[PDB]
Write an enzyme that holds these catalytic residues in place. Structure first.
Site, PDB file in Angstrom:
ATOM      1  N   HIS A   1     -42.261 -11.172   9.143  1.00 30.19           N
ATOM      2  CA  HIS A   1     -42.445 -10.401   7.882  1.00 30.19           C
ATOM      3  C   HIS A   1     -41.897  -8.973   8.211  1.00 30.19           C
ATOM      4  O   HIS A   1     -42.471  -8.223   9.043  1.00 30.19           O
ATOM      5  CB  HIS A   1     -43.957 -10.204   7.628  1.00 30.19           C
ATOM      6  CG  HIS A   1     -44.495 -11.478   7.031  1.00 30.19           C
ATOM      7  ND1 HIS A   1     -45.792 -11.855   7.260  1.00 30.19           N
ATOM      8  CD2 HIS A   1     -43.841 -12.402   6.253  1.00 30.19           C
ATOM      9  CE1 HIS A   1     -45.924 -12.995   6.614  1.00 30.19           C
ATOM     10  NE2 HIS A   1     -44.814 -13.353   5.957  1.00 30.19           N
TER      11      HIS A   1
ATOM     12  N   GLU B   1     -43.627  -5.424   8.767  1.00 30.45           N
ATOM     13  CA  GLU B   1     -44.708  -5.283   9.788  1.00 30.45           C
ATOM     14  C   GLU B   1     -44.135  -4.631  11.085  1.00 30.45           C
ATOM     15  O   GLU B   1     -44.206  -5.147  12.165  1.00 30.45           O
ATOM     16  CB  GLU B   1     -45.383  -6.681   9.993  1.00 30.45           C
ATOM     17  CG  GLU B   1     -46.034  -7.107   8.632  1.00 30.45           C
ATOM     18  CD  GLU B   1     -46.462  -8.555   8.492  1.00 30.45           C
ATOM     19  OE1 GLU B   1     -46.514  -9.254   9.594  1.00 30.45           O
ATOM     20  OE2 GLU B   1     -46.726  -9.025   7.428  1.00 30.45           O
TER      21      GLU B   1
ATOM     22  N   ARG C   1     -40.885  -7.730   2.698  1.00 29.24           N
ATOM     23  CA  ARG C   1     -41.375  -8.598   3.741  1.00 29.24           C
ATOM     24  C   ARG C   1     -40.595  -9.949   3.843  1.00 29.24           C
ATOM     25  O   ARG C   1     -40.670 -10.640   4.875  1.00 29.24           O
ATOM     26  CB  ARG C   1     -42.841  -8.906   3.413  1.00 29.24           C
ATOM     27  CG  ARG C   1     -42.918  -9.861   2.251  1.00 29.24           C
ATOM     28  CD  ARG C   1     -44.317  -9.845   1.638  1.00 29.24           C
ATOM     29  NE  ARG C   1     -45.354 -10.159   2.636  1.00 29.24           N
ATOM     30  CZ  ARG C   1     -45.824 -11.416   2.808  1.00 29.24           C
ATOM     31  NH1 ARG C   1     -45.365 -12.437   2.057  1.00 29.24           N
ATOM     32  NH2 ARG C   1     -46.774 -11.668   3.724  1.00 29.24           N
TER      33      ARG C   1
ATOM     34  N   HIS D   1     -48.096 -10.725  13.746  1.00 27.89           N
ATOM     35  CA  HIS D   1     -47.936 -10.107  12.400  1.00 27.89           C
ATOM     36  C   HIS D   1     -48.807  -8.831  12.328  1.00 27.89           C
ATOM     37  O   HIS D   1     -49.524  -8.492  13.321  1.00 27.89           O
ATOM     38  CB  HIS D   1     -48.702 -11.054  11.388  1.00 27.89           C
ATOM     39  CG  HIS D   1     -47.907 -12.264  11.135  1.00 27.89           C
ATOM     40  ND1 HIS D   1     -47.159 -12.411  10.000  1.00 27.89           N
ATOM     41  CD2 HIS D   1     -47.641 -13.359  11.938  1.00 27.89           C
ATOM     42  CE1 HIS D   1     -46.487 -13.568  10.057  1.00 27.89           C
ATOM     43  NE2 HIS D   1     -46.745 -14.153  11.253  1.00 27.89           N
TER      44      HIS D   1
ATOM     45  N   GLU E   1     -52.901 -10.846  13.876  1.00 24.15           N
ATOM     46  CA  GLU E   1     -52.597  -9.869  12.812  1.00 24.15           C
ATOM     47  C   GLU E   1     -53.045  -8.516  13.486  1.00 24.15           C
ATOM     48  O   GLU E   1     -54.249  -8.310  13.738  1.00 24.15           O
ATOM     49  CB  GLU E   1     -53.470 -10.174  11.584  1.00 24.15           C
ATOM     50  CG  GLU E   1     -52.811 -11.290  10.750  1.00 24.15           C
ATOM     51  CD  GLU E   1     -51.612 -10.751   9.956  1.00 24.15           C
ATOM     52  OE1 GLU E   1     -51.186  -9.593  10.013  1.00 24.15           O
ATOM     53  OE2 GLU E   1     -51.034 -11.705   9.335  1.00 24.15           O
TER      54      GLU E   1
HETATM   55 ZN   LIG Z   1     -47.096 -11.044   8.439  1.00 20.25          ZN
END
Ligand SMILES: [Zn+2]
EC number: 3.4.17.1
Length: 307
Positions: A69, A72, A127, A196, A270
């Site tokens: 993404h 990020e 993203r 991420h 994350e």
């Molecule tokens: Zn992500």
């Protein structure tokens, strides 16, 4: 810039800078790292993975991807710092040395190069990929919803203009298929981690189905240990669990796919923060983030070598 030792890891960089960094690293540690091209993005940019290995043929491997993404940024930044770290720690840190003496590590710093370039050029918050088509003026697919794992089911959108659009069909995006073919062809991956941001979570499968995976107790304990280690440096608090119980249903995700391919140690991180800065995390948080994430990843790798 001239050497990996002069590169500034405390700031965000552009695509060319990161690609030049790769060549510098290969040039400095030719016996440990190599740069492979596993595809080209939709807009023709090369897609590179760095392979870290002390030898062997087809040793069991660890896959780590960052930046799927594009917005990020903390992930690509952590990716560059991990690359350097591997080369520093080999021969110094007994645990890491043990790992690389028996396993290879494959690191994809910029998984979605077209979106990353776009975040620098036009819209910092983009993203998706940048693929286009026919029955829409909307561009791009959420590459983390394009995998063949519950593809098209609830938790992805079928609207091309959606931020969570899953794409025309599983693996339609070349950035995802390139990873799919390479991992299938290698056939000896033992761990698959996708990094991420943001939210401070460590998740395991699945996100597309309420079904529990058979290795739930083990992955959960590994997750708990990894979170304990990461918190150890700065006190950063993560929560862990399966995707669907922790967040919500989400389909076409990479780790659901990897796990279904038999790669048991499949986790998604994350990274920071929890919303104060979100995607625009300050450059001053790069190194601390990288350092603590490394302890979490190293914990999973250790369990891997041993099991
Ligand atoms: Zn992500």
């Amino acid at each position: 810039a001239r050497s990996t030792n002069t590169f500034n890891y405390a700031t965000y960089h552009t695509l060319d800078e990161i690609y030049d960094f790769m060549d510098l690293l290969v040039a400095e540690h030719p016996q440990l790292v190599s740069k492979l091209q596993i595809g080209r993005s939709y807009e023709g940019r090369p897609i590179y993975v760095l392979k870290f290995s002390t030898g062997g043929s087809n040793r069991p491997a660890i896959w780590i991807d960052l930046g799927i993404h594009s917005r990020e940024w903390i992930t690509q930044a952590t990716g560059v710092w991990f690359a350097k770290k591997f080369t520093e720690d080999y021969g110094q840190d007994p645990s890491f040395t043990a790992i690389l003496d028996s396993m290879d590590i494959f690191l994809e710093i910029v998984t979605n190069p077209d979106g990353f370039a776009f975040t620098h050029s036009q819209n910092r918050l983009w993203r998706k990929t940048r693929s286009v088509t026919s029955s829409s003026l909307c561009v791009g697919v959420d590459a983390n919803r394009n995998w063949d794992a519950g593809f098209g089911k609830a938790g992805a959108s079928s609207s091309p203009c959606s931020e969570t659009y899953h794409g025309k069909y599983a693996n339609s995006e070349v950035e995802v298929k390139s990873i799919v073919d390479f991992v299938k062809d290698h056939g000896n991956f033992k761990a698959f981690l996708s990094i991420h941001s943001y939210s401070q979570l460590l998740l395991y499968p699945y996100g597309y189905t309420t079904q529990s995976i058979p290795d739930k107790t083990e992955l959960n304990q590994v997750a708990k240990s990894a979170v304990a280690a990461l918190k150890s440096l700065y006190g950063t608090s993560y929560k862990y669990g399966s995707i669907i119980t922790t967040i919500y249903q989400a389909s076409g995700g990479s780790i659901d796919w990897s796990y279904n391919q038999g790669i048991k140690y499949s986790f998604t991180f994350e990274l920071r923060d929890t919303g104060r800065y979100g995607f625009l995390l300050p450059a001053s948080q790069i190194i601390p983030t990288a350092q603590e994430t490394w302890l979490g990843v190293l914990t999973i790798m250790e369990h891997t070598v041993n099991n």
